[PDB]
Amino acid sequence: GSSGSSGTGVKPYMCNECGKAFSVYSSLTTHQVIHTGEKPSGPSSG
Ligand SMILES: [Zn+2]
């Protein structure tokens, strides 16, 4: 999937917490979860 020519590429759904792009809207939201962390944790990237 996402087979094109321009390697660089580009996607509308991009995360700001870490900086990861996606080709799906839902995927972007389901991903940001890794930053939401509703429960209290220790080791966190950002
Ligand atoms: Zn992210």
Using the CB atoms, write b or e for 15-31: b if 16+ within 10 Å.
Answer: eeeeeeebeeeeebeeb
Residue 18 CA to ligand 1 center (angstroms) comes to 4
Spatial separation of the C-alpha atoms in residues 27 and 22, rounded to whole Å: 7
Residue 24 CA to ligand 1 center (angstroms) comes to 14
- Give the technique used to solve this structure: NMR
DSSP per residue, 10-28: --SEE-SSS--EES-HHHH
Spatial separation of the C-alpha atoms in residues 31 and 27, rounded to whole Å: 6
Six token digits for residue 27: 């995927």
Environment class of residue 37 by beta-carbon count within 10 Å: exposed (0-12), middle (13-18) or buried (19+)? Answer: exposed
Spatial separation of the C-alpha atoms in residues 35 and 20, rounded to whole Å: 12
Residue 41 CA to ligand 1 center (angstroms) comes to 17
Task: Select from 25, 16, 22 the least CA-distant residue to 46.
Answer: 16
Residue 10 CA to ligand 1 center (angstroms) comes to 16
Six token digits for residue 18: 């870490």
